[PDB]
């Protein structure tokens, strides 16, 4: 199959994996910090989605060093996955336009 679509699918499954692992590790890192809110796995998964999409409502965020490192990993994974989807769309469009120009 075309490399851009395979990479898009791989990035999707990798982002799902990163969301689950980030929820687990965020709860692990935040429990023990007085005042921490990112301490139950359901809302941790919600927060991981918020973080990967950059749609950060501000209802939840890490307060510890390791929670914030987990957050950075989730941020970069989400941003690069969505950018890879954009790149795959651009490649598809470029190929289609080349063909439409008979080249």
């Amino acid at each position: 199959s075309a490399l851009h679509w395979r990479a898009a699918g791989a990035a999707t499954v990798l982002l799902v994996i990163v969301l689950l692992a980030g929820s687990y590790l965020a709860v692990l890192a935040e429990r023990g910090a007085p005042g921490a809110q990112l301490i139950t796995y359901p809302r941790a998964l919600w927060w991981s989605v918020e973080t990967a999409t950059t749609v950060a409502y501000g209802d939840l965020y890490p307060v510890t060093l390791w929670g914030r490192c987990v957050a950075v990993v989730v941020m970069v994974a989400g941003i690069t996955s969505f950018g890879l989807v954009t790149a795959a769309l651009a490649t598809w469009f470029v190929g289609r336009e080349q063909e439409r120009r008979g080249h």
Partner: antibody, heavy 118, light 108 residues
């Protein structure tokens, strides 16, 4: 079947230490947390600490003096709390409870009555 | 740490009357409150989770309400088996904390 099994009682001499056990059955998930709660006779419930057996990480109530050390054995599915250098203030019922990582204590053990006396 | 105030400490009610325990948090905690019942010589028993969600095996007589800082546990038509201490517990912020408990008394 009873989900959390605790011994009925432990007698401890002042200054000595004791290891309480909590054997878990039923569904076990990587998101499980085992909590320990202290209750003195005629008093309320006091949270001591928590441990996540899948990782071994333990957290403790910082408002009280740390007398407890939490461990877990995954093969036997048993959580342990070591109370050290006990005095009469440590005499109480100690419960273990299981939380599925979503904030509430779905199940409690029967509690171990710890008496500190000579 | 979040303080859970349960006042009054003792509730006295006639049989068959509706009763309401109060739990007030020192800060807003959404709906992250859970209610437990402890009878004499017994271990705590989860009655309500997340302020209002029912628990399997708990009589429909029990309900919960509230959000933010003020929460209520209600029993419609109290009966003798309800005589117990009732505790609220929050999971919004670390560490989890307990209320000081309210005892239910029945005037027969």
């Amino acid at each position: 079947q009873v989900q959390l099994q605790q011994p009925g009682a432990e007698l401890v001499k002042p200054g000595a230490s004791v290891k309480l056990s909590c054997k878990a059955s039923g569904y076990t998930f990587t998101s499980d947390w085992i909590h320990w709660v202290k209750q003195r006779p005629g008093h309320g419930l006091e949270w001591i600490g928590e441990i996540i057996p899948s990782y071994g990480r333990a957290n403790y109530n910082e408002k009280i003096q740390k007398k407890a050390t939490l461990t877990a054995d995954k093969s036997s599915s048993t959580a342990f709390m070591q109370l050290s250098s006990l005095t009469s203030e440590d005499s109480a019922v100690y419960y273990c409870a299981r939380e599925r990582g979503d904030g509430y204590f779905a199940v409690w053990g029967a509690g171990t009555t710890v008496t500190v006396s000579s | 740490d979040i303080l859970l105030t349960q006042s009054p400490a003792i509730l006295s009610v006639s049989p068959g009357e509706r009763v309401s325990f109060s739990c007030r948090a020192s800060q807003s905690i959404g709906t992250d409150i859970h209610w437990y019942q402890q009878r004499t010589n017994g271990s705590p028993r989860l009655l309500i989770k997340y302020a209002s969600e029912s628990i399997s095996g708990i009589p429909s007589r029990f309900s919960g309400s509230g959000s933010g800082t003020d929460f209520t546990l209600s029993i419609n038509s109290v009966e003798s088996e309800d005589i117990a201490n009732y505790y609220c517990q929050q999971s919004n912020r670390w560490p989890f904390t307990f209320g000081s408990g309210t005892k239910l008394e029945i005037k027969r």
